[PDB]
């Protein structure tokens, strides 16, 4: 998926030229760089003007951390944002997938597969420290199931005891849940 | 004389250009957003330098640093802190620096987010702004490095406790006591202190109250030992 | 060396304590018991410690053991051998006069999430409360500052220690 | 050395050394290293000629002095050689320019 | 790591074999597994009443490996009392409980650990299927085995093992596990008034 | 105009190569500005000495460091004893810059060089190394200079872009 | 004016493969799918997403067909959700080739069992192809 | 080694560390329970060590009942120095052709400002200790034992003869 | 089969000459002088070199033998076993027709700083003098040629050798003696 298309007049790079149209792509999991690249993106494209972000996910997974920051960003900027799922949004990526947009503008593709659960996390060190670790990733876990619920309209004990372990989901299971709101076919 | 030459720069030079940090650059945002690092400082100063030359317009910078690395990951110094914040406490007689803390803002970049110009210096309402331990993780010195060791790292430490009380006006005897553990602070508290200005809540709040996960029974009768039942939430 | 030191019922902790060691010390402690239920058992101890649940192992086979248990340092015990230290009887814990005793709180492993991470840090939690009570209990010292001691990893000489609790005798007096 | 005569520079603390030529390890018989060995000779024989053109001395006293034994020359003993000429044209350090000041 | 303590090691495991008492060490595998069947059943040729006594100290370990054990424990005659020092996770904690009834002893300060079986599928679709529904057997002969053990119902031990379960010995008496704790009685320090 | 600005802040590198920055620093006829920001091990300290007199700014939380080089030989009994020559030679070659930068006897900078010396701001001035502590009006007067220096070239660039727009 | 998909992929992971065939379906105005060489699972499916009566193969290509693979690692009830997902997929993937081969879907599962390979003859046959170059 | 054994040789060979100090501290223990009086010999070569294990080999070597004379062999670098230099008094022998080295302490550290100047001053407890035993050995002061601890020390057996580390020469 | 020969006082000393196959030798020799003061030993030489520190200590062992200590070489003397060779006592060395023996300086190096450099130099310059006086005077040649000598790589016969003055009889009788 590398070959420039032209632009109003010359050859611009494809992922340029959607973002030039306020569509982002993301296509890598959640990792560090891709989230900076992207919270980078976003805030420049609502420095341009506030119209509206479009997200194309294909997110296979991805840390928690880098995600949330993603998500803030989402949250912090002017303009709204729509999120599709081309592919598949595991994990973060499903959390992203309901980062935007909470009045009706998730969309997924017919045949993507839709996954959430509990964000992961590993750290040792001193006693004291393990503490300090596993009670932030407490607090983590229920951040992102308190956006969950409220993004979806499940109880937030619902999700709680859902999403202790991976939850997959076909389109039709994910309108029914509340993960998204519509699916797109050939229109 | 120079604004309309910013705006001629942006009609040839600076609107075709590809790059998000050459279009970021054109915006006048410097995107503050991996462990800092030698190259990142040098790279954030000719920023800085050049976006002085261009105007005494305002400059926005966004942090989500972890701190100079994480704690599972080789360190780098605390020098490139020091650095930048010494070329950014330079620049703002000159320029504002709005300094706004997406994500996470580690020990370090702490010090770079209480960098910017009063009143202009804000945190997203879910970020986390850390006065973590004091510091170092390189441990790849010998018993003939003692002598100078210390020397280094109080001479480090201290360093950023005073820069610290020329952010928040506090007493540096306060932040000397509050190193020894990794200390972070909510955004609310962060102004407390005087790290921030101001807090940005979004225009639209989601996370609401869950509460009502409490139990809130009886008191457990005395005549019932409770088994080894070991749950989870 | 060691074997024709076994036969005299003496027992090398050297080392860091790890599963195959710690088993092996078991072991032998199963045997010293087996051979004589009366004859002092000696344990030379010398460790930069190791894991806490070999460690708390080795503590539960010392304090099985029907005949007497002398604990002797040397060198370095640290973490878990300053544990297994002052685990000896009262009155017959020694170290030589150039030991450095180290006292610590337990470390754990890494394996899932967050709610793995939970169990572990209930784990260390009570690892930590149990290091606690014991050692606060051998030395006569209230809980306060053994949880503040621990938390701070501060190498003790022999003299320091003993005035501690750790130690009843220095051999030789210095 | 090769340079022009009169138009050579050097930095004040630039670390200038000769060394015999060296061949990298090759495996045969006797004939090989013999045949290396040639070659190695001829390229002494090449940088000696050089430097008898540069530095103005006999071709094989050149072959001695430099090529012989790894040597180092400061500045100073490289110029008393014929090594360099002179400093880069301007050089002037700094207290030297403050005290003219 | 040292082959000339791993010889005196080997020398201390065989006067204690001699004395019935079978070692349980490390995480159960195949070969170490292999090892103590062939012990307990020579124990067993030996002599057809004496107890013999199997110290458990593992960190975990295969299902097959550890079922063989516990198959070995439950065909010979003798009654095999199992005591846990160190720490028995999840098949040492299975082994310890799969001790004679009313012989499953424990230290005091051991570590008792019980959570449903760690594994792998690999290939194509149905071979995963099939290694799913293998280790979801493993599961469900573990837990009715320790529902059978502990006295519980199959559901309370279904729910407990859900995730990492850790016990202590005293709690481990309560829950159904161990039958009793090995100390001997300590001074008692008198307080003030 | 045209005095070079040097911006330092390096925690390491061979000492030879601090001594090439230090002369070419030298050999330019304008002047040289040389900021060190936070830090300057013994390359980055030979680079800053080497800046004109009235412009070495050393910045509050800047540490330099006084050292002789780290090496490693391998070779002959003979390339031990020459190479080590090497390695004292560029111990008195960095002794003669120090002296040459800071006045400061040369036995006691070779004694600096034997163990590893580090010096903050104050005591960086006090040697020599640096002639003024870059506290934040200094700092401002340093963006300033870049400034006017700067505009000299922001004007041609003006023009330019006049007559293109 | 119609997307022109030329296909020679000896392999990938069927996921991606669905994932293609869908982007394919997006689009209104036709889709020419060529196959040249090999056309395995994750461009099987690609080949099969082309415009019914424009899907092409040449006579030396051959079709691959088979079920997804996985890894699993976790506890036994990791496996089994993860297992069950597997499932999910490879039912999908036989729905997309009944869709396309106008054939049992339960016959066209027992055929994706294992590794399965058709000539273009076959591939035609099947339905993944409609004509030879 | 079990031919050296029998004959209350114990060998000091090469850089020291844990599981070499427990072999040594175990030889040691157990040649005084068989025999109270009569000596033991140790041969010395050694580059180094830890300090810790150095330090249980010394206190081991003190107290047991048996003389333990150290001959030196080869080398004794610092830490195997220190050990040879413990020998009784008398008994500290040397190879003519051996060579004696004494340097400080050595080791890393990482953590906290706290944690690693815990480990500085530790260090330095051990410079303190060692400088301490031997001016207790050699009869040198304090501060001329420092100033030689400080940087590499080589010295010949003859001059560590005049020195003190050393008793005599086995040229015999 | 070694132990047959030990009894017979014969020490083989093999391969590389390190630390610990130091401690070895030198123990065999004290054993074989402290069971027996007044028949000689015999040491084989087949070594291409060692270090300067475990040479001395094999060195001093066979100075310390009451025992009359010859030496017989065969294959190869590098740098420090021909040194050995060299010391065993005069008219009882003896080498094989075709044995190679070399004299040559060692190798060294040092690191950090350059303190501990000029130190490892001193120390380098040190076992150049050391070995070559004690070289020259077994030798019996003039210290300066010794000293020139030990520089030179390369290999020699052990009829150069006997004319050198290094060994003093070569098992053969000259018969097999090839250039």
Known sequence: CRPPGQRQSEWVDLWEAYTYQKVVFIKEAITEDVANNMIALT?????????????????????????????DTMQYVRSKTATVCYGLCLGMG??????????????????????????????????SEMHIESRELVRMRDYLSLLTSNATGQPYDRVIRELSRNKWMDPKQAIEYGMIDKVLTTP | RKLSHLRKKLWKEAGPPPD????????????????????????????????????????????????????????????????????????QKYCPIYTLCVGNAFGEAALLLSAGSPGKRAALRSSTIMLRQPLQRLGGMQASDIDIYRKITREKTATMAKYLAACTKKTEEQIMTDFTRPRYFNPYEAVSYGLIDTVLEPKEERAVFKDWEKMGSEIADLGLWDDEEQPLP | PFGLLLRQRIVFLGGEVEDFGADAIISQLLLLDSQDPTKDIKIFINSPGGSVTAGM???????????????????????????????????????????RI???????????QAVDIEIQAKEIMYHKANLNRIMADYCQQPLSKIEEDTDRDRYMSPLEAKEYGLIDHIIGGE | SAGQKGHRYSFPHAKISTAPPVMNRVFGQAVDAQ??????????????????????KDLETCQKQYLSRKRYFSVKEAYEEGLVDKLVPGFMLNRFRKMQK | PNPLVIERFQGVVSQLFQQRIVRLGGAVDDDMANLLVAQLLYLDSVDNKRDITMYVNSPGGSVTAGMAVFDTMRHIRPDVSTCCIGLAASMGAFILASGQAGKRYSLPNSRIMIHQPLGGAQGQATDIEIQANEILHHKLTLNGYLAQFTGQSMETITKDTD???????????????????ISKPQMLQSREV | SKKVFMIINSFGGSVGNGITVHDALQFIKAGSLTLALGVAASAASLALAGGTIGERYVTEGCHTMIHQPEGGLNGQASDIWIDSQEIMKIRLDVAEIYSLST?????????????????????TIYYGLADEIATNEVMHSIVEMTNQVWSYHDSKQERLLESRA
């Open chain 6, 103 to 123: 006045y400061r006897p040369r036995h006691k900078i070779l004694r600096d060089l034997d163990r590893d010396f580090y010096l903050t701001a104050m005591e």
């Open chain 2, 20 to 91: 998000l940090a050459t279009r970021l650059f054109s915006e006048r945002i410097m995107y503050l957003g991996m462990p800092i690092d030698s190259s990142v400082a040098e790279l954030l100063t000719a920023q800085l330098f050049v976006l002085v030359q261009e105007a005494p317009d305002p400059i926005f910078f966004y942090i989500n640093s972890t701190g100079i690395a994480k704690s599972t990951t080789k360190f780098g110094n605390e020098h490139e802190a020091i650095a930048v914040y010494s070329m950014m406490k330079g620049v």
């Open chain 1, 94 to 127: 499903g959390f992203l997938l309901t980062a935007g947009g909470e009045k009706g503008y998730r969309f997924a593709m017919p045949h993507s597969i839709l996954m959430m659960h509990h964000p992961s996390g590993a750290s040792r060190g001193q006693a």
């Open chain 3, 102 to 112: 180290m006292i610590h709180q337990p470390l754990g492993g890494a394996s899932g």
């Open chain 5, 163 to 181: 995730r990492d379960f850790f016990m202590s010995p005293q709690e481990a008496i309560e829950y159904g596990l161990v039958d009793a704790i």
């Open chain 3, 57 to 99: 192992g080795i503590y539960d086979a010392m304090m099985l053991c029907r005949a007497d248990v002398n604990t002797y340092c040397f060198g370095l015990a640290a973490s878990m051998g300053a544990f297994l230290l002052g685990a000896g009887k009262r009155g017959k814990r020694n170290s030589m006069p150039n030991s």
């Open chain 1, 43 to 71: 805030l420049y494209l609502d420095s341009l003007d506030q119209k509206r972000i479009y997200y194309w996910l294909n997110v296979p997974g991805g840390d928690v951390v880098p995600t949330l920051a993603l998500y």
């Open chain 4, 35 to 56: 045949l290396q060995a040639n070659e190695l000779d001829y390229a002494t024989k090449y940088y000696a000629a050089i430097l008898a053109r540069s530095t103005g």
